[model samples]
Target: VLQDVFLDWAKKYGPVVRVNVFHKTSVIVTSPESVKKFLMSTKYNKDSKMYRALQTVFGERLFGQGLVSECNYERWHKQRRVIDLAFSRSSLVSLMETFNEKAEQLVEILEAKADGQTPVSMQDMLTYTAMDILAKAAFGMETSMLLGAQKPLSQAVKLMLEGITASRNTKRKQLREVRESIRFLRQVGRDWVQRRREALKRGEEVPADILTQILKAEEGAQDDEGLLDNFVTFFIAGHETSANHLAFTVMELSRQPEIVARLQAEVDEVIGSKRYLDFEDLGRLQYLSQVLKESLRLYPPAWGTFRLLEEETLIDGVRVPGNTPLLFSTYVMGRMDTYFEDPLTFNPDRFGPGAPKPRFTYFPFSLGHRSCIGQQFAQMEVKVVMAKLLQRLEFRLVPGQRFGLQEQATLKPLDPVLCTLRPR
Candidate 1:
């Protein structure tokens, strides 16, 4: 709600507006040039003051100096170097099979409900699909969350997310449950790490998954602090964001039949009667690419990214003082009239080929040194699932559902995108 309020403030006060949140003050930047200067430059660091809350929710270890919250440049770079190998082009290409496998599972699950009468919560199902993909691909474990089995980890993750949005007026038991959920999640992480360590100690064959890579990055047998940091990080960062993106994308597509028709036609042309998507098919489904881009433009999971300005800087000819917080929001920029024509319209053609690129105005996954590492992985998963859904099924949005958004740790549909499905 305040994000939209800030959007209106940005519109009225111009690109550089000083916002006061109680005792703290921050500069909200909207100019593309300022975004390019701030985000592209490595000199600016992540606002750890803002991030510390996420790193440890309710005084307990959550993301704890994980790749997304690590503010120290050298330390973060070390972690990024090791993680990059897992997200590398070769690594991602190898993961196409896993991506297709889990996404196809989603299709099979949805087929049972494709009766055109049963209401399916696309958000919940897609959340399961994303978590399953992350569990299998990143950790080499099976969650089967989509199949409605083994949901404690899922519950823990959801509870922690809810806690992030909890108010000061929240009940004591609610806070206790949130803390308990945090402990449960970390305990699960600890178990996974120890199992892998024991496997390695026994000289057994261990799949070179992301979990392995993370373990291999260890600095000479340290504690599980760092390992557990990423274990929780991947579920929250990698899983939640991608799931929310899919849910919001479908929510929009359900409202626009013509757009869905175009997407369906593209999927049909790209992979005729194919159950699994090839890695190259991602490139061929250009319209699908545009639709996902447009989706992110509207509903970026992480609504805004904040950076710390240590020294005085000039943004849009306004001099900003030293030691100030700088804020950037794709949600605000993507909806601005100056940046996009008919900003509220869900027209994928705005991202069509040959159109002028939205330079710094669009960065759903953010940009530069701190950009999301799993961006390619998330997009690949979304494309595979969307392609399969388009190829095999038809869906219509159930009426009376509020087409609104909610800001937990990430932004998601306030009302679940309920829909009735049928075999195409």
Candidate 2:
């Protein structure tokens, strides 16, 4: 919703608009040149105080200086280096088996309610699928969230995510639940890491996954807290955005039958009765890829990026004073007609191969060296789950529900994308 306000400002005030929220004066910039320079250049770092809110909720350690909240370049660089190995092409390719398997599990779970009569929130359904996939792929944990056995962890994550938005609120009871949720999630992280360390001590084989790499990120110094920081970071950051993306995609597809027809047709031609999607097969789902891109263009879960400008700089021919924080919202820029023609329309054709490429106006994952490390991982997982769903099921959006946007920790459909499922 804030991004919508920024969009209005971006429309009226040209490229740069100075906004005042409380005593803080931040600038919202829409110029592609400015975005390219700030995001791609090493000169600007994340606004330190801006991210401080993410490190704590109700004075409790939440993200706790994790990779997302770690503003110290040296520490963030080291953590990112260690985490990068797990997301490499080969490493991610090796996890395809897990991806396909987990996605298949989702299909099976949904099949039970695939009757045309049952109403399902595909948003909630995909969230479970995303969570389970991240657990197995990143931590070697078999959290059967879709099976409903891991309800506590599920509830904890939900509460914690809500806590993030509630961080903006001064409400009382929700704040208590928020702190309790934070503690429970961290406790789960501690136990999992402790068990993994025990496995290592006993000379047992361990999955060389994100959790192991997180441990390695703090090898010389025994940092139990920092390790939990990353555990919560990856756990929350790794899955939620992808789930939002998938959910938004489903919401859009359900409304646009022509687009859904194209997507289903693409899945049929590329996948053709195959139960499991291979890495090569994923490449062929180009239209589906466009659909996902279009979805993010409209509803990027992680809406924007902010940087602390420490020195006086001229951005987009406007001179700005030093020590100012600058905000860049893909959510705003993506909807501007200056960068996109008919920006509000949900058209995936704009992302087709020869379509005019956007420079800095389309960064759902931010950009530069600090762009999302798990983006490829997230995209692959989303593709597997969506491809499988498109091949096997038909979803019709339940009427009377307005598809509105909610700005929680991430952006998502305000109302659940309630739908009735029919087996294909």
Candidate 3:
């Protein structure tokens, strides 16, 4: 994985190491000061060719249109402003039942295997849960890739990304099938948005959800295809990172019994026999927050992001060129002993209230105004999932699987964390 390679360079070269991947040279910045400055300040642009290239993850023509990968500062700022309010605490609390209901659906799937005989892939299970939650919360649909009655939208998403990476060495002339598949995915988003629009037109009362707010935001956007771009953005980026984090947490929970017990004990105290977790209850799971912080420390999904410098600037005491790609990997910095006392150790104690917060060393989400617009939303969503999963179930990690990470836009569990669940 490049993350590991970058980590090696970060270790040997003291924070700033430049490497040539082809004709392109990417400088990996592991210095905290460098990270804070570049990520938080203006001499640089968060826009990168890598993120621009990934905009195609939505489809062919939609490249560079969605907020996630849009390089245009003006467009991104507007889109971010519109959607930012959708994830506010008030809006999020309205979706509380969903966090538990969707998780309960997964619990039912596991209960069929509570005999301690069936080993489930925590990764795949989490992927389903995360997908369903995003479908309800972000897109306002009852998407059921989990129920197995409906196919997964992820197949289309995977097909597009695979093409970009698979066809990286050579571009194929015939990508019609890929185009059609991407359109099918887009049509799915279109249908969801159109339905909500149709409902509003009929004067039907609707919850002021993300989808509704998307339509609300679009009033001024005056964009037709761009609306679908917003939908596609959530359709593609919304689910997997949370799933990956949950899966990694499962792995760590298996390895560390003390942490698991502490987490379970915390869940028991806050949510005893309660299936629905209130906003207040979600806020109280401090131990779970520590565990999540520790997990992300090891495996930040958007591990590293690159910035395209607008002009020549000094970074990490090195003279850098203009238009150079500066790569910043929290996955690398979080593991360095310079910032963390025992960098590789999965210690939740490091994130306790008494423990001082990290400056630029930790960035599970990116930093500054360019940080993940959905940071609070994702954090709250995962808390709901974790609190529910911990309270209802006890997990045993299945042995003999080589747990590894797949490095890409997100750091995903390469192999599933196989585990058997016990009903507590």
Candidate 4:
């Protein structure tokens, strides 16, 4: 029902349409031109109550009052400055070793589980891998929850995802239930916070992770609630979005053996069976990166981004009243034949050298001030993981298994995308 509605609507409505779903006035922009106008035009604004409602759950403190979600332009700008400092090119380079190490661990886990006869859930495995990568990269501490070691943190994350997913559907009662669940999870998260605070007080060496950097930023501003919010937001935003992308990529590659073979060949030619992939090597693996880009086009992790009108505005000459919700669906845009030739086809060559497309047509991470801060980091991590895994195993989907696509907070493959992995 969702696929038919979502896909068919775009096919029928051209690129831009105004939809009133659940009493929310949302402007759906699906074309490169329309998206550019929506994102770059002065009429569009990010400081909307719709975004605030989302932040209330996923980011109660940081974005609730902090930079990215702040409606106040001045405050948001200040916060962006600080965030930009943390995600500088040099910082990303410094973090490459950590990303590579985690990728290696992921490859090891898959190789160990490769029995050749049994079908493995690549969705579950990739989700676990994403969780581990975010934990290590953001917290500098390993919970090892991805590898059968479930902890409070992992449980909280699962609850959070479930809650957010429930919130998206029109099921009001289910949304309430998930909110209650999240409230309890927040309490559990607070306990972890207290423990980490005490450890820091005791002179325990803090690892060079996103959490540590966030903590330092908090101290500089003395915003405890903001720090906590940032931590929780990273847990939700950082892990879930990456997991969706990786899972979709794996599913796509498994179904298309020729594409997977080409990617494997590219990895072999570029890295030559390296045990680890470095940031420097990323530039050399252009084809692999292109494959990831193409996957994002088909199934963007963050499917739709919403904003509210701050004042009465005119969007593409249509007058919208203040506080009306505006949504831009990247999912529809990527599949628009007018914007992309052969939009439904999986062709990485579209993103390769000399590929011609408008700037904002293929935005997987979003655009403008609220664009994802961890995009470069996420891309590097995905590329490294794919490259390293290609060196260790070749993968294919199990026969007769259906891959169901579902929309929670992010676009994820509905559970049990069973695949068979053979050791290379």
With candidate 4 superimposed using the best TM-score fit, by how many Å does residue 11's alpha carbon deviate from the native?
Answer: 3.3
lDDT of 1 at 87: 86
Sort the candidates on TM-score, descending order. 2, 1, 3, 4
lDDT tens per residue, model 1, 36-152: 998998888888776777788887888898888889888899888987888888889988999999888999889988898999999999999988888888887788998898778
Clashes of each: 0, 0, 0, 0
Cα lDDT of model 2 by residue, 267-362, tens digit: 989998888788998889999899999999999998887899889988888888888889889999899998999998999998999888788899
Off by over 4 Å in 4: 1-7, 41-43, 57-63, 66-68, 171-208, 220-223, 311-314
Q: Could you tell me which 10 consecutive residues in candidate 2 have the lowest summed lDDT?
A: 163-172
46 Cα displacement, candidate 4 (Å): 1.7
Question: Against the true structure, whose lDDT is highest?
Answer: 2
Give the TM-score (vs. native) of candidate 3: 0.93
Cα lDDT of model 3 by residue, 7-39, tens digit: 888899877788753235778888888888888
Estimate the TM-score of every prediction. 0.97, 0.97, 0.93, 0.88
What are the lDDT scores of the predictions, listed in order?
0.86, 0.86, 0.77, 0.71
* Model 1 clashing residue pairs (backbone): none
| lDDT of candidate 2 at residue 341, scale 0 to 100 | 93
lDDT of 4 at 27: 63
| Model 1 misplaced regions, further than 4 Å | 20-24, 167-170
* Residue 278 Cα positional deviation in candidate 2, in Å, after optimal superposition: 1.0
